[PDB]
Symmetry: D2
Subunit: 447 residues, 4 copies
């Protein structure tokens, strides 16, 4: 009765989006009640009509929430009575809000997961398709942000795509456990009217039904799981954001964002701020915060139902909206991205080829340890001569090792360098292309 207490319980402010799933759940329940004999065929007909009118009021946006509406379920419950009179009270028989709440969220989630899945797969398709087209671009690979060796721009794009593919895989698993109907669990012990849950299932299109009533109304695993999946996904995008922010600095000059996804200044148009990327990177923390909150909420709570559980809606609503938006922005960034081949090519230094020189020898039967030393020597010689490793003459190389035949010239070529990695997941064109194929088959399975 305390005014502040009423306020703290008012979910009506944010749960209004659960309106349709509420109605969708009420209709199914009304149909099962008819089967239980609780409702006469005519009462059901009248109820389903009332319910269907409520949906229209919601769709049109002409539904009026009264001061007495603490939550969505109530709002729609009130409207039903206001419409079909007192027969609406029968609809309540046997069920509980504890039962409705989880059915509402799962139902909302199934719908939400589908939209998110579509956008995720589209992000992947965008990454693989751009990889295919730009398969000839070669740039430096980084370890500790220091240039290590050449790689194809496509191997870089594919590494992100491959990680995102595991996200779709996890999403599929999460969606499986969310597709379990909890309705018909009552307030704690089950539905007292021996209702037909199978009917409810088929009506709401769930894949199966909850095994235990106590568990069904008190567990929020499906929320934690969705939250974890969302968090790892965001970690993946934060890593992609970091890369593209760094690659788009004047210093690197590897690429440029579209004006639609960046901010500039009339005073110095050259300065293109990566707003899009910074927004995506920040959402990682926001989503993480939601995962951390629900985990702390659930810790140490006894069985069975407790009010603490009401924290779930705001968490899933916020993460669902964040992902739906974030994903679309990411797809936009990647697709309208402007790559600079010249700058990427210019970053490639002959010094990065010292290892390839050692590989050349290793292949000519020279044991690793020995081949590594020969390269170092060549690096030092080139240094003392005032030139670069690729500038060393056959004679200079011979001085170091007689194994250095004239064909060593081919080593000093960045494309030939990249083409050494032909093993399954390397940078050679063959491997890259194989990856594009594998990923395309994955998307077909919808993983």
């Amino acid at each position: 009765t305390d005014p502040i207490m009423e306020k703290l319980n008012s979910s009506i402010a944010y749960d209004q989006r659960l309106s349709e799933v509420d109605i969708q759940g009420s209709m199914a329940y009304a149909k099962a009640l008819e089967k239980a004999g609780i409702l006469t065929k005519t009462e059901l007909e009248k109820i389903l009509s009332g319910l269907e009118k409520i949906s229209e009021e919601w769709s049109k946006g002409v539904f009026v929430v009264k001061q007495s509406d603490e939550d969505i379920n109530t709002a729609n419950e009130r409207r039903l009575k206001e419409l079909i009179g007192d027969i609406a009270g029968k609809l309540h028989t046997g069920r509980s809000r504890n039962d409705q709440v989880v059915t509402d969220l799962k139902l909302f989630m199934k719908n939400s997961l589908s939209i998110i899945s579509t956008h995720l797969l589209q992000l992947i398709k965008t990454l693989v398709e751009r990889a295919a087209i730009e398969i000839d671009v070669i740039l430096p690979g980084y370890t500790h942000l220091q240039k290590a060796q050449p790689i194809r721009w496509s191997q870089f794009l594919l590494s992100h795509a491959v990680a995102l593919t595991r996200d779709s895989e996890r999403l599929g698993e999460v969606k499986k456990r969310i597709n379990v109907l909890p309705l018909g669990s009552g307030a704690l012990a089950g539905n007292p009217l021996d209702i037909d849950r199978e009917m409810l299932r088929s009506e709401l299109e769930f894949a199966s039904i909850s095994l235990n009533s106590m568990d069904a109304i008190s567990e929020r695993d499906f929320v934690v799981e969705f939250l974890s999946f969302a968090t790892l996904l965001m970690i993946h995008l934060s890593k992609m954001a970091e890369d593209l922010i760094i690659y788009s600095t004047s210093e690197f000059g590897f690429l440029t964002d579209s004006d639609a996804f960046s901010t500039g200044s009339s005073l110095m148009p050259q300065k293109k701020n990566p707003d899009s990327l910074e927004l995506i990177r920040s959402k990682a923390g926001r989503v993480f915060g939601r995962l951390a909150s629900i985990l702390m909420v659930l810790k140490g709570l006894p069985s069975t139902y407790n009010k603490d559980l009401q924290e779930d809606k705001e968490a899933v609503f916020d993460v669902v909206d964040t992902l739906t938006a974030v994903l679309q922005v990411a797809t936009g960034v990647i697709s309208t991205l402007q790559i600079s081949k010249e700058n990427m090519e210019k970053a490639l230094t002959p010094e990065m080829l010292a290892t390839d020189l050692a590989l050349y020898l290793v292949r000519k039967g020279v044991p690793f340890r020995q081949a590594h030393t020969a390269s170092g020597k060549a690096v030092h010689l080139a240094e003392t001569k005032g030139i670069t490793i690729n500038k060393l003459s056959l004679e200079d190389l011979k001085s170091i090792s007689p194994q250095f035949s004239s064909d060593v010239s081919q080593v000093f070529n960045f494309v030939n360098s990249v083409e050494q990695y032909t093993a399954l997941g390397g940078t050679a064109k063959s491997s890259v292309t194989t990856q594009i194929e594998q990923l395309r088959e994955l998307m077909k399975k919808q993983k």
Copy 2:
């Protein structure tokens, strides 16, 4: 290098346990090298023998770790050099610490996850089994920690078993993705020797091979998923600890812990401290802490490899060491716990039957709200007459609603109340029985 930075880079302190898996990676790799013409049969033979001898030393606990051994991979390399000499230097041809580390971890985790599931299933079995034996026991069902309605003890044990089975499903799922061979990805661009990754897979027993070299070297999703799974599991166990702790208070008296999993007082013979349950409950934060740190370690890191990743080992070893012990202790507690059917039944109050009184009129065709008002008048009446509702005379009842007949007597029985919930997932004995079977099959499919 700075003395402190060197100490911070050293992992030899805790990674020693990865010795066997290092050797296993080295053996398989040595074989692939020979196949790639990098090693001769005689060189392969000598090396494999050396590797076997190092294993021997670890097993006998006679391996000596010198002060300069930065980590386990290093320790074994030095020892191989000390054993077979210079040809040992050929083993690292084309191999990088970057793809060695992930291979070691995934390998160790594969083995750990098998042991952990063994314990998880033993826990689930235990719960399902006891539930079967004590299916006739009834106790209060709680909502907001207040007695709500009669519930079967078994329906309570099963709510936990059902939650724990979902964990099993998730454990199976993380293992699927941990079972992917990352070896042969080189430092980041792949292996430059056209090495047979497929052969490495077969040797090491992984189910598949990584699609992208950069991803395989930098991703730590497998660590995240495992910690995420572990955290949810702990959330389930801390809830279970909360219940059993409250149920073991002198105020509840529902059960007692065996002396093996508690602590008492000589001065106070009946005071039994539930240490086991509190230790289990406290581990939830410990495990969650590891998840949080790794997500933070990963957030914002750029491609490809970074030293930051080193934080994965300690987080993983800790969680595996925690779950193994906690699951075992949880099993012991559940199995040796003694319940008091007396205190459980004695806790069942007539007030709890008020709802059934309403269910009764509903069955007599009485509209829900009408049936609800009547039970309210009934309880209030009994109140104004200083008596329990079950002691209201038939005439009193009829004075409230004509539909109250002699059969309303059956209503005032806890077993009869419990039986109302025959619907799928309810507390009726038939429903509990079905659940026990369904779970037995679930467990049966553990291979």
Copy 3:
């Protein structure tokens, strides 16, 4: 796409409450600009008046938010221009959204903290008052949720009050660092007009001025601190809620919540669900989540300004709104709960006095180890005799130890038990009153 990023970049939906502080910043800035000779006295007067008008609009609730308004700062600029013409543009001279946004949050937070401080002090005051009035109530002291020894209810209430007092102390520390003027830092290099920051500090009533432009613009320590403070505060409240919920069970029966702070049933008049306490408890996770998200948002961010920083607003707004409500509900729960001195005293058992029996011997000159065994023998003997410790006759006591005398009867008195704890901080009445005074001395300093 662009429109998606556009909405994702908009904050007007929530930051409208920063309206007044924005107006306040602008007014101070205008005054300093005039002093710097950027504005004419006439121009100043026009701008100030215009700012007052806009302030009125928001106050009356008639401010029209044009769709072009991406945030509050832009909204007010639009309006000012619409009210006084082109001269309003001069107000932007040398200013940036970078130093505007931090001044806005600090000003809002500095205000909000005053309100939270008030509510916090009221909670403590309430706990201390009830502790004084109910200083004679005695109940069991718990350890591992098992009865340990009798304590005074006031000792229980004061343990929560002292903890809350440290939160109150941390609050002042936090408030101290929020009171630092960041305005006049520009985009990052400072303010280029040699503006008078001292004048700005005076106008806005800040305690000091920010030391470094880059830090003032990019630091969010004041947010992390506030959130860290808020989380610990909630941990304490969650512990308090945990106690009251357990104590209000029908099993414990120590107390009952007010009607305004609980939910009952018409069919079950004695079922009082502690809704208020469960809400308070759940707000811990919700507040913690905000801490964790901001900590992650800042982790690894390069200098200086980054769009990631905008996630701060919603974080503090939520936490500020949560604390304000929860503190008010906690105070009401305490002020209006009814305790059961009857039930509390019933819970005290003779067995709890076994330890005092040993103390009695210790004070007689008996070595600790020996006095302990004697009490155990006294306990066992009682057991075998089917009676309680207090029932043992002097004959039985003397056979155990000659040090037992007639005065041993005094031991078996709960009040006499408690009164042993006169050493500072203990449960003796003299200690409880000393605490009451000390906590009141403290609160006088917190104002």
Copy 4:
């Protein structure tokens, strides 16, 4: 699985570093007992001498830890009996582990905090010192990691030092709440022997004593506060690492790390990996994870003592070790890094002066909007002419606006640019000198 639980309680594996502080608390308690009449002068001197012996055994590393020792407190108790005989048992009179534990950590932390403080102050001193020396170096300031405007290198160093001084400020506050004596609280109701807590306070060197026994036993605020301080400190360091990791890229080339704090390549001499900076950045998550764990462990725990509290030791030990190391490495890096003034100046672009161009007109009396637009035109004219704005002829400027005079030439100077920021906190030399003086005074107050 009893042995499993037993191992779970064996803190002896890590708590050994608490030997001295345990010895210290004991000696203070022994003296207090003697004063209270529990010990005779002779028993007292025997116990004190015995305690000294144990101290030495620990100092000499000769103390034999028998496998029956659960923790350090027990091990020491055992040893005293093995030295002084049954007189040792007198020390237990009225003391509790609950009481010892908190006192042990508080003493350990107090000492550890002094060490952390000095290292923190050293880092701050090094940053402030390098800023004084290198006050003439200028480089670009970044917003969105895009060149914004020229700032002095010293402004960048000071921005980090200032954030670090706040951390120092927080450490002192934490320190104050840790410096409160919890000993004398007993198991939960206080000490029954009327022990002199003031004596204990004096002996143990605490500033004050706990106000309430139940709080002193159950609270862990001092642990969470330390962890929060640690996390923010690490957040500041992770950011500093990020800056220096990027600034040391080949692409930026602003600075080079010492050989002692990096790792290079034999084949690539000019490649130096920022290992130190990556290890530092990675600890932020490690420390954060400990904070999150403890918070999760404390959430919802009932009064008073629970085994869950046992998770604090490892958390504190890990963070104290980590911080101590990280702080020394950070100081090393800053003190020995090589700066490239040439590459820094080379980063300065004429375009960055466009905004100063507008500022120039504002000082002439041209309103902000007009000035910003005129500058924009000059930027566009230059662009269309294929030249930089600093090469725009006076005639050209006069065609954009007659307000441009010959003195506009002074705008095109990066030192003149930096020098406009004379307002407090700005980048002008005078403003940077003032920060140094302000920092110096602060360092005097907190050491």
